[PDB]
Design a protein around this nucleic acid. Structure first.
Ligand SMILES: [Mg+2]
Ligand SMILES: [Mg+2]
Ligand SMILES: [Mg+2]
Ligand SMILES: [Mg+2]
Ligand SMILES: [Mg+2]
Ligand SMILES: [Mg+2]
Ligand SMILES: [Mg+2]
Ligand SMILES: [Mg+2]
Ligand SMILES: [Mg+2]
Ligand SMILES: [Mg+2]
Ligand SMILES: [Mg+2]
Ligand SMILES: [Mg+2]
Ligand SMILES: [Mg+2]
Ligand SMILES: [Mg+2]
Ligand SMILES: [Mg+2]
Ligand SMILES: [Mg+2]
Ligand SMILES: [Mg+2]
Ligand SMILES: [Mg+2]
Ligand SMILES: [Mg+2]
Ligand SMILES: [Mg+2]
Ligand SMILES: [Mg+2]
Ligand SMILES: [Mg+2]
Ligand SMILES: [Mg+2]
Ligand SMILES: [Mg+2]
Ligand SMILES: [Mg+2]
Ligand SMILES: [Mg+2]
Ligand SMILES: [Mg+2]
Ligand SMILES: [Mg+2]
Ligand SMILES: [Mg+2]
Ligand SMILES: [Mg+2]
Ligand SMILES: [Mg+2]
Ligand SMILES: [Mg+2]
Ligand SMILES: [Mg+2]
Ligand SMILES: [Mg+2]
Ligand SMILES: [Mg+2]
Ligand SMILES: [Mg+2]
Ligand SMILES: [Mg+2]
Ligand SMILES: [Mg+2]
Ligand SMILES: [Mg+2]
Ligand SMILES: [Mg+2]
Ligand SMILES: [Mg+2]
Ligand SMILES: [Mg+2]
Ligand SMILES: [Mg+2]
Ligand SMILES: [Mg+2]
Ligand SMILES: [Mg+2]
Ligand SMILES: [Mg+2]
Ligand SMILES: [Mg+2]
Ligand SMILES: [Mg+2]
Ligand SMILES: [Mg+2]
Ligand SMILES: [Mg+2]
Ligand SMILES: [Mg+2]
Ligand SMILES: [Mg+2]
Ligand SMILES: [Mg+2]
Ligand SMILES: [Mg+2]
Ligand SMILES: [Mg+2]
Ligand SMILES: [Mg+2]
Ligand SMILES: [Mg+2]
Ligand SMILES: [Mg+2]
Ligand SMILES: [Mg+2]
Ligand SMILES: [Mg+2]
Ligand SMILES: [Mg+2]
Ligand SMILES: [Zn+2]
Ligand SMILES: [Zn+2]
Lengths: 91, 22, 77, 112, 50, 251, 63
RNA sequence: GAAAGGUUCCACGUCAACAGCAGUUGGACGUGGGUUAGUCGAUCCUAAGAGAUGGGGAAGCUCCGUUUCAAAGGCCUGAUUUUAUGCAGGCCACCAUCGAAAGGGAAUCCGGUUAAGAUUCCGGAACCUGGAUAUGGAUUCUUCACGGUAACGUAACUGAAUGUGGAGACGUCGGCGCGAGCCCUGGGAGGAGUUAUCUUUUCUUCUUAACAGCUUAUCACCCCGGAAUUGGUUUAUCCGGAGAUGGGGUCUUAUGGCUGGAAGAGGCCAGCACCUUUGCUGGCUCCGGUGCGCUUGUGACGGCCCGUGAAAAUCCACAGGAAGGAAUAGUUUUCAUGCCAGGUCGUACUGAUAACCGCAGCAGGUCUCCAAGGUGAACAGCCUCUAGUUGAUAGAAUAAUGUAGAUAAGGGAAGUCGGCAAAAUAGAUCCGUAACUUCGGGAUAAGGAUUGGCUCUAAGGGUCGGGUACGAUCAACUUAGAACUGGUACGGACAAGGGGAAUCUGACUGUCUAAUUAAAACAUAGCAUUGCGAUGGUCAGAAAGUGAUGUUGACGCAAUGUGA
RNA sequence: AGGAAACUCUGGUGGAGGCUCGUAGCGGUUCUGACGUGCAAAUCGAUCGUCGAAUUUGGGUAUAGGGGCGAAAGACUAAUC
């Protein structure tokens, strides 16, 4: 059954530290404990080892990523503009 | 080891050829 | 501290020019519940290891004892 | 219900002071100090345990023969079989690719 | 301690050799002033501090 | 009065950085010949965690051009670098994430990191997690590039300076609350002895300028002149302003 | 004699229990015994051919 | 056993002093004896760190710095056979040293033995390192092995410089599997105890080391094959066209089994004996079973981190192909056997209500290993076995006042600054559980009932069994219910929450005034501000060619305030 | 199991937490108990706080006097601050 209404993974913290802080650590702990799609092997095997290190259990590849997500939006847009500038330097 | 072992090996081979020289 | 399972390896062992002593040990064993037999162990004391040969037939045991070299110091117990 | 003692002067539960209780032919219990357990050698590329290789402490490998330390392949006791296979494939394939790159980059500017 | 150094054991040996009473023929020498061993040391009363 | 705590910090007895579990200084490869006349290729063998550092490190292996051997440089891993990836470092290197192009050979708006101040110091700028340096513009004459730093400052460095293309990995770390003195303890336990911090106003006047009084109060103004001396600089050093920052700072 | 009477079932009422039911016997190990029994029986039946793999799978899941 | 002590250890003699009484006794006094190592440690390695040298400071005692603004050295092959070791060569660039008796690390076990020593001595059985070396075996006229599709196998089955890789080498917690020892238990062979009565009964012995050979495994890997009707599968849900299940194999040998070691040892008994050294002679030492058991080791996993949880010595392997090599002969000593040596220091004893520190033979303090049975959730409390003590000045009486422990009719906080102290409550099962809330809690809320013994009943399992539904057998403590029974007693001793309504204050966990204040004080997470882009900020230093932050770079460092 | 869907609900499994009761341990609230020419220049007894970590602790090592160290009491720095 559904054990908790809204605290989720932050039920391990009990009543401590305040609800508005528990909400932030909930939204970030879900991300850092989620599994992700490996862009090399195609499987849902990528897990965080430490902050910034995301390794695939299947293909044993290790990607440098965000502290709690495998890729940040800033890194995504930097990759996009770097691709565009690389495409522009020939033209 | 492997270094003193190789040196012992060459010492034994040198002694064998030097005693069979005669 | 080793075991030998061939009588002719034991024979080529007991004339190895560093073997000095051997010991023939007699044991009372029971292969099944009705047959108490007499096992012999021939232990040659080499310079680094003790080689044991186990024989369960008294005829092969005594024939091996006759075939033992005379210069070897044997100990019967 | 017998109780044992350390047989050395180390009174502490460190990794080099691991004991195991054994029963002697005297019928008594006695501690017996066991050395630390060995780790299997690992592949240089994939980091998995190399099969065919004996599991010993590093000084004990000086006492065994070459059979216990190797297999009968290139990169025998060093790399995994699949790692050897994929590096062979990579070598042959990209040397062929280097050849075809050589001939096409030669012939384009030879024409021009 | 049991695992001790040779220097400590040598000082302990010298102290063991020194821990003795007078030879009683010394009180018979002429112009003798020594009655007893004033430098006597026991392990329960004073420590060597070594 | 005593010698105060921030005054004692410079002796470096118990205030040194705990460097037992660090993989080494994360520096760039030396600008020998290949990096300034062409490129050179290395391979990312492993991306590892460094103690006391929020950003992950990357162990890149190059070949020595003059001796038959392998050199292992420790880069700060940029976001997107994976194991087995080929890193290209040099003047003729292609503009990709992880490459170590000089700043003269990148267009405007390029996002770089681990940037050299002067060519040869092997990475000084934008090395913390999630930080990066933007290239604003170039000056071919007077060969300098203007860059925007993470602080918002604008520097003018040599165009021969190098930088790793991309963003330093481990970003968004400080967006999570630590929630616990234990977590702060374990964070600082591998950096240095700078935690916890006793307020100077809760000390005695022998221990701090702010100490003493029948109520906990600072007394004089907490803004300290830059020309003050050691033992006095406890507070806001050379504050141009103070209080809550409303509006843009006119950067 | 006390162990014989306990095996037979005496000295086990509420006045002789000082620990909780979970402390006397964990519900986890009870569940483990149950699941091992069910999985062992299902594998035995499947390898004997009395059930097919498609029935075995749903029985495994709902067990 | 570690630190510490140092002869306190053991024997003989002994009681003047000490053992706050005594003393014939003693850790006392006097006289002697006692500590045996190639394998246990130190020695070796490096950690935090200390610290010469080259240099640079300082009037100087000396300071900095430890690879630096240094011309910082040694390694193998040989060649020569006036010959010594130069010259022939070739390689190499770390760059003192010290620093762990708990880190890393070459190698030893059993039995016996002394008044006091033993993993050290005796006997037996092994192993490692270093060095010499000969024989056998292996290999070669296809010179430097063959077999297997493969994973890989073997008794061996050249391999320099150089390079690469691995081991050494690693957190913590949870549960699960397996192993060892212990616990429990059946049969049998012995001995002992109880026996008014009962008890095929109670207790005890039935053991097998290091090392060696054969075999033995989760994981992992290989071959065939090609999977949706998706399958396999863990306690815990992950895996599969990047090739599952399935069939067949390969491997690590932790570990376990058999054999050797090794029954000759040790143990338990019986009989014969004799001033006696005292033995001598016989037997038996066997076969099992169980488990959420305790302790411990290990494996495969899983959880946690803005924490990802030493280094070096040391050893091995691989890539490479230098050089040397056979046919009347060799080449090999990572295979077997065989020979020699293994130094120096420690080793006794206590390790604490008497061997250490506290002025002492002080209720204080002082690191760690082993850990039986019953009750019971439990290394709780209580009782017992093995082992160890029976030590602390005693005797006689039983006044007051004390200290410690208790009990009290009726009332029930009227006592007192104040319910201080004490009492009450208490375990387990079932029922029931409010305001408020940050929705997680509050909560064991509050508040009730039951609990013994005996005789039964029910449910909950394993292993074997089927041409090409069931039966047999073995063994668990878990829960529920029902009668019956008793001076209504039953968590019967032990053990074990008092609760509620509010206010002030601090968010919480945490920390401090050792020896009068543990708190509302400090800290904290969170919040906010300030300085700084390295020719820099903050700080140190007498100076320095000096340092800390910094193995750092604004998601950072430094300085403050406030305190979820 | 419900629902048109979004998704909701029930029963299990699992075993998180600077959670909790409570040993060893660490500490030292109250009796303002004992003692107070003591066993003791800080102890004893009961009652207590905490007990998986911001834990406890051995050894090694670093910081030395207007200095050190200090989760800050002017606390500690060999019964000395
Ligand atoms: Mg092999
Ligand atoms: Mg093998
Ligand atoms: Mg601190
Ligand atoms: Mg503060
Ligand atoms: Mg104050
Ligand atoms: Mg002042
Ligand atoms: Mg003030
Ligand atoms: Mg005040
Ligand atoms: Mg019942
Ligand atoms: Mg239990
Ligand atoms: Mg459960
Ligand atoms: Mg007296
Ligand atoms: Mg007297
Ligand atoms: Mg004595
Ligand atoms: Mg110096
Ligand atoms: Mg040393
Ligand atoms: Mg050592
Ligand atoms: Mg050690
Ligand atoms: Mg270690
Ligand atoms: Mg002894
Ligand atoms: Mg001997
Ligand atoms: Mg062969
Ligand atoms: Mg390693
Ligand atoms: Mg783990
Ligand atoms: Mg055996
Ligand atoms: Mg051994
Ligand atoms: Mg398969
Ligand atoms: Mg073994
Ligand atoms: Mg333990
Ligand atoms: Mg000794
Ligand atoms: Mg001893
Ligand atoms: Mg002792
Ligand atoms: Mg002790
Ligand atoms: Mg003791
Ligand atoms: Mg004393
Ligand atoms: Mg003293
Ligand atoms: Mg214990
Ligand atoms: Mg029980
Ligand atoms: Mg108990
Ligand atoms: Mg007394
Ligand atoms: Mg009354
Ligand atoms: Mg009242
Ligand atoms: Mg009143
Ligand atoms: Mg009154
Ligand atoms: Mg009043
Ligand atoms: Mg009270
Ligand atoms: Mg309440
Ligand atoms: Mg508080
Ligand atoms: Mg106080
Ligand atoms: Mg107090
Ligand atoms: Mg405060
Ligand atoms: Mg600076
Ligand atoms: Mg302010
Ligand atoms: Mg807690
Ligand atoms: Mg608690
Ligand atoms: Mg306690
Ligand atoms: Mg007290
Ligand atoms: Mg008092
Ligand atoms: Mg008094
Ligand atoms: Mg004050
Ligand atoms: Mg003091
Ligand atoms: Zn992948
Ligand atoms: Zn591999």
């Amino acid at each position: 059954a559904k054990r908790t209404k809204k605290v989720g993974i932050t039920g391990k913290y009990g009543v401590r530290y305040g609800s508005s802080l528990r909400r932030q650590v909930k939204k970030l702990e879900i991300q850092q404990h989620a599994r992700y799609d490996c862009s090399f092997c195609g499987k849902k095997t990528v897990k965080r080892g430490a902050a910034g290190i995301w390794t695939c259990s299947c293909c044993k590849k290790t990607v440098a990523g965000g502290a709690y997500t495998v890729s940040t939006a800033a890194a995504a847009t930097v990759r996009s503009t770097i691709r565009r500038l690389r495409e522009m330097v020939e033209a | 080891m492997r270094a003193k072992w190789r040196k012992k090996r060459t010492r034994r081979l040198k002694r064998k050829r030097r005693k069979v020289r005669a | 501290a080793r075991e030998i399972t061939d009588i002719k390896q034991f024979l080529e062992l007991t004339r190895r020019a560093d073997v000095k002593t051997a010991t023939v040990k007699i044991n009372k064993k029971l292969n099944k519940a009705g047959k108490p037999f007499r096992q012999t162990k021939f232990k040659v004391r080499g310079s680094s290891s003790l080689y044991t040969l186990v024989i369960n037939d008294a005829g092969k045991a005594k024939k091996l004892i006759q075939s033992l070299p005379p210069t070897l110091k044997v100990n019967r117990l | 219900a017998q109780r044992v003692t350390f047989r050395r002067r180390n009174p502490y539960n460190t990794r080099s002071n691991k004991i195991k209780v054994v029963k002697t032919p005297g019928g008594i219990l006695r501690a017996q100090h066991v050395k630390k357990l060995a780790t299997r050698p690992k592949c240089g590329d994939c980091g998995s345990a190399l099969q065919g290789i004996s599991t010993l402490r590093p000084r004990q490998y000086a006492t065994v023969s070459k059979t216990h330390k190797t297999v009968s392949r290139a990169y025998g006791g060093s790399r995994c079989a699949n790692c050897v296979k994929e590096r062979i494939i990579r070598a042959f394939l990209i040397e062929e690719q280097k050849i075809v790159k050589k001939v096409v980059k030669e012939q384009t500017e030879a024409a021009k | 301690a049991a695992q001790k150094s040779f220097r400590i054991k040598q000082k302990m040996a010298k102290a063991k050799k020194q821990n003795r009473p007078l030879p009683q023929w010394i009180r018979l020498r002429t112009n003798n002033t020594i009655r007893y061993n004033a430098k006597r040391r026991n392990w329960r009363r004073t420590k060597m501090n070594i | 009065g005593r010698v105060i705590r921030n005054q004692r910090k410079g002796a470096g007895s118990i205030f040194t950085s705990h460097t037992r579990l660090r993989q080494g200084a994360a520096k760039l490869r030396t600008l020998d010949y290949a990096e300034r006349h062409g490129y050179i290729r290395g391979i990312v063998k492993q991306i590892v965690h460094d103690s006391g550092r929020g950003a992950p490190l990357a162990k890149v292996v190059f070949r020595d051009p003059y001796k038959y051997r392998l050199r292992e440089e420790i880069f700060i891993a940029n976001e997107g670098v994976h194991t087995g990836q080929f890193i290209y470092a040099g003047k003729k290197a292609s503009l990709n994430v992880g490459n170590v192009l000089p700043l003269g050979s990148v267009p405007e708006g390029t996002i770089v990191s681990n940037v050299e101040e002067k060519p040869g110091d092997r990475g000084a700028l934008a090395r913390a997690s999630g930080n990066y340096v933007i290239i604003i513009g170039h000056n071919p004459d007077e060969n300098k590039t203007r860059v925007r730093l993470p602080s918002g400052a604008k520097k003018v460095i040599s165009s021969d300076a190098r930088g790793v293309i991309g963003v330093i990995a481990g970003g968004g770390r400080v967006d999570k609350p630590l929630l616990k003195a234990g977590r702060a303890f374990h964070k600082y336990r591998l950096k240095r002895n700078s935690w916890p911090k006793t307020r100077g106003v809760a000390m005695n006047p022998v221990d701090h300028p702010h100490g003493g009084g029948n109520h906990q109060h600072i007394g004089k103004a907490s803004t300290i002149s830059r020309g003050a001396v050691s033992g006095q600089k406890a507070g806001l050093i050379a504050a141009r302003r103070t209080g809550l920052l409303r509006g843009s700072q006119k950067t | 004699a006390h162990a014989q009477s306990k095996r037979e079932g005496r000295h086990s009422g509420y006045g002789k229990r000082k620990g909780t039911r979970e402390a006397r016997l964990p519900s986890q190990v009870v569940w483990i015994r149950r699941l091992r029994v069910l999985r062992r029986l299902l594998a035995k039946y499947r390898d004997a051919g009395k059930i097919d793999k498609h029935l075995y799978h749903v029985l495994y899941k709902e067990s």
